[PDB]
Amino acid sequence: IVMTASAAIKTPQMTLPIWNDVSDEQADTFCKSISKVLLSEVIDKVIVT
DNA sequence: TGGAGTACAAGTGTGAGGAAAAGTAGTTGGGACGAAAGCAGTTGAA
């Protein structure tokens, strides 16, 4: 912050307030709609013959 | 009964020897407490 005035922070974050009518089950479904999903994450095996 | 030759010693010049403790002659030994970060004008080619 004080030195270097870095536009490239190591861990840039963003805090998102959710509404007062949206629930926790609706919000956990919502976090999945944003997060990056590699194709690696859904693969159990790759068998190559 | 006088002289002709002649070895024994009194007597006279030439250099050659003797010695030592000082110095100097050739080899070998030895002398040399530093494998740091995000960042920026220049600068890579697209």
Please report, rounded to whole angstroms, the spatial distance between the CA atom of protein residue A7 and the C1' atom of nucleotide B42: 22
User: Sign of the C-alpha dihedral, residues A4, A9, A15, A16?
Assistant: positive
SS3 content of chain A, % helix, strand, coil (to 5): 25, 0, 75
Which of the nucleotides in strand B have any atom less than 7 Å away from a protein CB atom?
Answer: 38-39
Please list the alpha-helical segments (H only) found in A5-47.
24-32
Please report, rounded to whole angstroms, the spatial distance between the CA atom of protein residue A13 and the C1' atom of nucleotide B21: 107
Q: Reported resolution in A?
A: 2.7
User: Sign of the C-alpha dihedral, residues A5, A8, A12, A16?
Assistant: positive
Nucleotide whose C1' lies closest to the alpha carbon of residue A3: B38
Contact yes or no for A30/A21 (Cβ under 8 A): no
Q: List CB-based contacts (under 7 A) with strand B.
A: A 4-8
- In whole angstroms, give the CA distance from residue A24 to residue A27: 5
